[PDB]
Design a protein around this ligand. Structure first.
Ligand SMILES: OC[C@H]1O[C@H](O[C@H]2[C@H](O)[C@@H](O)[C@@H](O)O[C@@H]2CO)[C@H](O)[C@@H](O)[C@@H]1O
Ligand SMILES: OC[C@H]1O[C@H](O)[C@H](O)[C@@H](O)[C@@H]1O
Ligand SMILES: OC[C@H]1O[C@H](O)[C@H](O)[C@@H](O)[C@@H]1O
Ligand SMILES: OC[C@H]1O[C@H](O)[C@H](O)[C@@H](O)[C@@H]1O
Ligand SMILES: OC[C@H]1O[C@H](O)[C@H](O)[C@@H](O)[C@@H]1O
Ligand SMILES: OC[C@H]1O[C@H](O)[C@H](O)[C@@H](O)[C@@H]1O
Ligand SMILES: OC[C@H]1O[C@H](O)[C@H](O)[C@@H](O)[C@@H]1O
Ligand SMILES: [Ca+2]
Lengths: 1275, 148, 80
């Protein structure tokens, strides 16, 4: 059947009905939103029963009522049916009880023993499949598997002894047989399971006390060591050396030809002196065309991997890969292949290479072949980087922290800076060991804001933005007024003080509220303990108030059906025993509740100044918009890259869902008008309004208003006219649960300019402004809310408004929300003697002149609401009425603080005026900042006092040097940028080069336009990171989580890595970097002398940052390059280098010396030489058959002696590998198995050979073992 | 474009190019997931993406399941979302009901105008006769709903 | 019976159940009886019907081994 959408589900008499978009009750088979359902003739939905439509016999599910497969006992005999209702042939079907039948070619179920797809199965006389049990079919007895039902070997206990049964149902005699768990046993001639050490068929196996065959198990069995095979469990003496490579010399007739022309940067492609897997070098001679050796010319570069390899495994892989590209006999080579053979094979490939270079007259084909091959190898890709997605790692796949390592990577040393996670609550590091350490790593290249030099540069940038117009256009009216601090908890909290003190010095923000409020500044500070920090520090920037944003989520904004009560908005716990009668403040609660109590807020108790919002560019936007794209198959993952066209298509579904007349929302938020009604009437907050609630989040800037625009616009204008004075808030509710009459409808009131209380009748200053001010707001979260006929709902407009006429601004109903622009067009209602507006289930209102109106207090459901909303204002409001308070020039407070929550601060409204998912401008005329200039007027009249612009920085775009791209970057929203000072300047050739938002002139025009209309402009200050730096350096890196803590089980610790950390040095960061600091030090010395908390030091302007590099970074997101992309010799663990001729280290082949490689015995023990010709000391080495060995400081393999403990404690240059290992007599390290010591104690050794302590360990056969603290196994 | 099980009984799915699939995948209309190794999981919960999901012991298919957190059981659906205000199964075959809180409901419960009987363990009882309201009630074999 | 004979061209092919009204089944049995007498005149034989009845009868559980509890354990192995 054809699908339908936009009809609600209703329940009558215990049954689901579905009412169409048409408004018609539905009968018959119906595909509703991709689910196939049925309704009988009364309109009820069928669940857990079969129905007959057309030729089909269709079952519907017992929970959902959705069409699915079942077996029906049609007439006498069972018959299978699919989801579409077709009788099934030659197919399995499971019925409602989870029982399985197989129906044959005629549709009739098979009974008895059967073979299906090579699987033996049994069926009872009713056709049902036996699963997970024995069964006596014929002479035999057969066990059948739990889920497949396939015949399998199993053991059962007959009498008191275990017995073995095979797959054919025959008992096992003189043989090995398994059980379902996975354990192997052996059963003798008499049928009885064997135990202990047993020799059968010339081989010895060890069976434990339980009779389990033990594989990969070491122990002294014959009073002599014995290792039991991983494959079959058969005992080897482990006396024979398993390495297959003797010491061999590699030098031959080609060595001097392929050796390096020079041991320096001329002849070797490199990074900071080091070599990489894809390094090309200049050989002394070149086998041109594969015929004749000729001296090389400077341009004749060849890949290092043509001639050298880190190990035989890599060499073999190189040979196999290049072979596959037509370069020689296609080969299966292994690390086990002899070194000589691999080298000979590499030369026939070299010959072939030189032939295709002559044939193509190009080397680009080879660059691509090498690049591709290199990425194949685990050590040269992300497989050795430990990609993880938990926590902030979710964004880009994981982080590396750079290290101070003056010996190997001195340019990258930070000078003992890089203090990580100095967020506000951990500004002094005193929570470094707990979760209270800040998540310093977020995105891209994380800047080291704990470094004084970098702190000074952030101030330079800050100055540049606050004087952007002066500096870039000599236009003193085109300057930003205030800032938003991006990612506060992901940076060193000193930046707050630096910014605060700058504003104090330059604008005297600590002097008056007028000064402070002229430079409105906000924080993106998510941590729940940030508000109290910010307030202790004097509120230099306004904290967000997540507690109210949160409660909107729970009670209104999130979820179609189940929501927290509106009661929770009150936070009655604020008062002792929620005594709303007694109102005694609770001096000592468990660090909980909403930031500002509004139950009876008369402005008498000091509160923390704040901004608050319902949504943001980065809250309830990014996830829904992507879930919508995922849901319609446009992308697969949240991290996945999408194109702008892909975004546009998804946006169409997002919009369809948002404006859905059904009233249901899958991705979008519910009750946004109702949420704004509360946000915009709340005392003691600077509300912020999200562009995307006013206009559509995609496409062009201001292209099309949202359905919420009228209501929010009305609320905003009404806020100018009526919102002042004290507040009260109550609910028809006392807690989680509602008594009989209770509605849980919230009533929020404001009184007028000087009126602070319910019972206050007049102002102290005898101003009359109050009489036509004030507002009443009623809101619910229940669309199915019906009042009792008894019930009355009251707005206590206050005793300053006795007998006054009030008129509606906004009233909800079943098709939308009506908006009333002026007193004449709206229904009036008059307050009583005590000043209460009384409401009933049914109301008859009269217009002041026009007519009589009917209205029910009814929860409604439509695109604009899921609940109730009523807003009422006093009639008689002047056209120019302004209830706002101007900020006072006087030094009102000696507290030292900048912002103060009061009527003046509350008179402000911030507009967050962009969306991250805007389309790119189709023309210069439609660029955001051009549009803002033409439309400035419109925001003045909505009461916006500060305009929060998007970050104006040039997007890093599609640029991607490694690792996962982020949406900020490819959507060009300005949060991901390469140059911090480029805000849309022209290309150097003179051509325009706008950001997503327009040119730099367009920005200055936009900012001026806002000042011409009395609004401020907010700059997005983004100090935490920078993207896509084009220059490479070699850092020392450790793999870390968001807090900069080393991952628990990582090998990636202090390794050399190639990162992209260096800026172009010829960009706007080079022009303007540090330039304004000297002028500033001269003019305000104390800024440069004042100590910061986290460092104990003042900012350092002695060094200017014209070019970024690794020393000023904490780290980066993993770049998918590999743990050992920077080439290293396994034997000595030293990295190759060619920077200075006095400290060169190269493989000996490349210097035309003789490189010997392999294992060689001597009277003392075994030694090993790497492919580069150096002896292994204090290092682990892996042979060509995959076995691992440790070579001690003296250069000798560690091996166990008879009668001595095989377990050895290893302390190596590579620290991560430290631990206790188990080395066998032939030096092989035991891995992923148990090992007995000389005294009979059992230990376990992990994937990498380390002993495991103090935990339970599980087995593939479901055996559990326990390891004590000292390592021993209690089991 | 085929499944293969290796010697250890671990399963990979190789695509059109012979390269194994990784992450969340739909195959023959079945939702699954393969690890960084490239081997699919069986009878386990992997926290892939935003929410946790149980995997079929032999089929590896996404299925509703319930796991124990603290002392109180929870329900997870086939899409990996926790279940609120709904019935959900576990791998053994028992049905439970979960409220807004997610606590498994117990005893006689009336939801959506129908009455179901959940035993001490929270199992929905089908084809069960008993005097529930002091009055006889037979609970449906199909859905467990009480008829008189 | 009605469904089986219907399948052999003796009338409208029917899905009838035990739930079908007795009246409807009896009416349907007579239209099948009519059809039967026509094929007896057409063929001048009743052997075709003997074979049809024999086949139908074995279809029914009460008239075949399904109600006889076939088992093969012990000497029952030989003949069921
Ligand atoms: O297509 C369903 C299922 O097929 C495979 O399961 C195999 C299993 O891997 C083999 O060892 C074996 O026992 O036969 C089973 C059924 O074919 C895939 O391994 C699995 O991922 C997939 O769900
Ligand atoms: O669909 C796969 C499986 O579903 C079920 O678990 C049935 O018990 C089983 O027989 C079937 O193979
Ligand atoms: O020792 C007497 C008997 O013992 C066990 O039953 C053996 O399985 C059987 O072969 C032997 O005849
Ligand atoms: O008050 C703390 C929280 O408790 C719980 C409520 O459901 C939630 O909405 C509220 O925010
Ligand atoms: O998200 C806030 C929630 O925190 C915990 O879940 C509380 O138990 C709950 O009452 C509250 O609503
Ligand atoms: O986090 C905000 C919430 O915390 C809890 C309080 O009980 C509730 O009133 C408030 O809305
Ligand atoms: O999705 C198709 C797969 O389903 C499962 C079956 O075990 C397998 O044989 C088949 O390839
Ligand atoms: Ca940071």
């Amino acid at each position: 059947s054809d699908p339908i959408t936009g009809g609600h589900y209703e329940n009558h008499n215990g049954y689901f009905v579905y009412i169409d978009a048409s408004g018609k009750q539905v009968t018959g088979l119906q595909n509703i939103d991709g689910n196939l359902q049925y309704f009988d003739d009364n309109g009820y939905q069928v669940k857990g029963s079969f129905r007959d439509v057309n030729g089909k016999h269709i079952y519907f599910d017992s929970v959902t009522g959705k069409a699915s497969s079942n077996v029906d006992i049609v007439n006498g005999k069972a018959q299978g049916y699919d989801a579409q209702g077709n009788q099934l042939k030659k197919s399995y079907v499971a019925d409602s009880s989870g029982q399985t039948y197989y129906f044959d070619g005629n549709g009739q179920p098979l009974i008895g023993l059967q073979t299906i797809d090579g699987n033996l199965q049994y069926f009872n006389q009713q056709g049902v499949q036996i699963k997970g049990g024995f069964q006596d079919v014929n002479n035999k007895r057969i066990y059948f598997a739990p889920n497949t039902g396939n015949a399998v070997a199993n053991t059962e206990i007959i009498n008191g002894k275990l017995q073995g049964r095979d797959a054919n149902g025959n008992q096992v005699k003189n043989a090995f047989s398994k059980d379902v768990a996975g354990n192997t046993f052996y059963f003798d001639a008499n049928g009885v399971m064997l135990t202990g050490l047993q020799t059968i068929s010339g081989k010895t196996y060890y069976l434990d006390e339980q009779g389990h065959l033990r594989k990969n198990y070491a122990g002294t069995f014959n009073n002599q060591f014995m290792y039991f095979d991983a494959d079959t469990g058969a005992g080897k003496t482990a006396i024979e050396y398993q390495f297959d490579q003797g010491l061999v010399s590699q030098s031959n007739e080609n060595t001097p030809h392929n050796a390096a022309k020079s041991y320096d940067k001329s002849s070797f492609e490199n990074v900071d002196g080091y070599l990489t897997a894809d390094t090309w070098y200049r050989p002394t001679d070149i086998l041109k065309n594969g015929d004749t050796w000729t001296a090389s010319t400077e341009t004749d570069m060849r890949p290092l991997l043509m001639t050298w390899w880190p190990d035989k495994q890599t060499q073999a892989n190189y040979l196999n890969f290049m072979s596959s590209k037509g370069l020689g006999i296609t080969t299966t080579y292994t690390a086990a292949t002899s070194q000589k053979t691999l080298n000979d094979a590499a030369f026939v490939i070299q010959t072939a290479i030189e032939q295709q270079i002559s044939l193509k007259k190009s080397t680009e084909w080879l660059r691509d072949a090498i690049d591709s091959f290199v990425k194949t190898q685990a050590n040269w890709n992300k497989q050795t980087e430990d990609e993880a997605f938990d926590g902030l790692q979710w964004l880009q796949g994981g982080f590396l922290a750079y290290q101070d390592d003056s010996h190997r990577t001195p340019n990258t040393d930070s000078g003992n800076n890089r203090k990580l996670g100095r967020q506000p609550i951990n500004i002094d590091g005193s929570k470094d060991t707990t979760d209270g350490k800040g998540s310093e790593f977020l995105l891209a290249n994380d800047i080291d804001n704990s470094n004084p030099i970098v702190q000074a540069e952030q101030l330079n940038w800050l100055h540049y933005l606050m004087n952007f117009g002066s500096i870039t256009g000599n236009n003193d009216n085109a300057n930003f007024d205030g800032i938003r601090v991006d990612a506060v908890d992901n940076v060193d909290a000193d930046l707050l003080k630096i910014a605060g003190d700058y504003f104090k010095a330059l604008y005297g923000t600590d002097k008056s509220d007028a000064n402070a409020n002229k430079h409105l500044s906000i924080l993106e500070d998510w941590n729940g303990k940030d508000p109290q920090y910010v307030n202790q520090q004097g509120n230099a920037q306004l904290t967000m108030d997540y507690t109210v944003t949160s409660q909107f989520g729970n009670s209104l904004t999130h979820g179609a059906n189940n929501r927290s009560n509106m009661w929770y908005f009150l936070d009655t716990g604020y008062y002792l025993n929620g005594d709303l009668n007694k109102k005694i403040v609770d001096k000592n609660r468990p660090n909980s509740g909403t930031l500002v109590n509004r139950i009876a807020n008369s402005g008498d108790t000091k509160v923390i100044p704040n901004y608050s919002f319902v949504r943001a560019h980065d809250y309830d936007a990014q996830d829904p918009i992507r879930k919508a794209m995922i849901d319609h198959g446009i992308i697969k993952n949240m991290q996945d890259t999408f194109t702008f066209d892909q975004l546009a298509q998804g946006m169409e579904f997002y919009y369809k869902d948002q404006e859905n007349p059904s009233g249901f929302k899958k991705y979008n938020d519910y009750n946004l008008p109702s949420a704004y009604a509360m946000l915009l009437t709340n005392k003691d907050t600077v509300p912020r309004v999200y562009y995307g609630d006013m206009y559509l989040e995609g496409g062009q800037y201001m292209e099309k208003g949202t359905i919420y625009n009228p209501v929010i616009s009305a609320l905003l204008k009404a806020r100018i006219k009526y919102v002042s004075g004290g507040q009260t808030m109550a609910t028809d509710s006392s807690g989680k649960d509602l008594k009989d009459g209770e509605t849980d409808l919230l009533t929020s009131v404001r009184f007028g300019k000087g009126i602070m209380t319910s019972d206050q009748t007049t102002t102290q200053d005898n101003s009359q402004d109050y009489k036509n001010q004030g507002i009443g707001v009623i809101v619910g979260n229940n669309p199915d809310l019906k009042l009792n006929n008894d019930k009355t709902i009251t707005l206590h407009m206050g005793k300053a408004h006795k007998n006054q006429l009030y008129r509606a601004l906004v009233l909800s109903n079943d098709s939308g929300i009506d908006v009333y622009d002026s007193d004449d067009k709206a229904p009036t209602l008059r307050t009583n003697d005590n000043g209460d507006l009384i409401f009933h289930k049914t109301n008859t209102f009269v217009k002041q002149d026009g007519t009589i109106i009917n209205y029910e207090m009814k929860g409604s459901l439509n695109a604009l609401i899921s609940g109730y909303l009523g807003v009422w204002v006093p009639v008689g409001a002047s056209d120019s009425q302004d209830a706002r308070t101007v900020a006072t020039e006087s030094s009102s407070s000696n507290d030292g603080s900048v912002f103060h929550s009061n009527a003046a601060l509350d008179s402000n409204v911030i507009y967050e005026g962009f969306s991250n998912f805007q389309a790119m401008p189709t023309s210069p005329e439609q660029s955001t900042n051009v549009v803002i200039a033409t439309k400035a007027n419109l925001f003045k009249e909505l009461g916006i006092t500060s305009f929060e612009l998007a970050p104006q920085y040039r997007s890093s775009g599609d640029t991607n040097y490694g690792g996962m791209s982020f949406l900020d970057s490819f959507l060009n929203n300005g949060y991901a940028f390469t140059d911090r000072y480029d805000l849309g300047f022209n290309k150097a050739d003179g051509n325009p080069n706008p950001t997503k938002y327009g040119t730099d002139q367009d920005l200055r025009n936009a900012i001026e336009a806002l000042h011409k209309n009395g609004m401020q402009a907010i700059a997005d200050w983004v100090p935490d990171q920078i993207y896509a730096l084009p220059g490479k350096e070699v850092v020392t890196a450790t793999r870390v989580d968001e807090r900069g803590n080393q991952l628990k089980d990582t090998d990636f610790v202090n390794l050399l890595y190639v990162a992209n950390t260096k800026s172009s040095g010829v960009d706007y960061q080079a022009k303007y970097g540090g330039e304004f600091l000297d002028k500033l030090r001269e003019e305000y010395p104390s800024l440069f002398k004042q100590n910061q908390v986290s460092t104990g030091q003042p900012i350092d302007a002695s060094t200017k940052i014209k070019q970024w590099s690794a020393k000023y970074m904490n780290g980066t997101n993993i770049l998918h390059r590999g743990a050992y992309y920077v080439l290293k010799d396994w034997a000595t663990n030293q990295y190759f280098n060619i920077a200075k001729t006095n400290e060169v280290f190269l493989p000996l082949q490349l210097q035309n010396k003789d490189a010997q490689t392999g294992f060689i015995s001597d009277a003392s023990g075994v030694k090993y030489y790497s492919i580069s010709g150096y002896q292994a000391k204090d290092t682990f080495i892996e042979d060509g058959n995959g076995n691992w060995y440790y070579f001690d400081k003296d250069g000798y393999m560690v091996r166990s002696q008879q009668g001595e403990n095989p377990i050895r404690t290893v302390e190596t240059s590579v620290n991560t590998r430290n631990g206790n290992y188990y080395f066998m007599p032939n030096g092989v390290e035991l891995r992923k198995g148990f090992g007995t010591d000389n005294s009979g104690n059992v230990y376990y050794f992990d994937d990498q050979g380390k002993m495991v302590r103090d935990k339970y360990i599980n087995d593939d056969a479901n055996n559990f073992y326990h390891l004590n603290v000292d390592g021993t196994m209690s089991r």
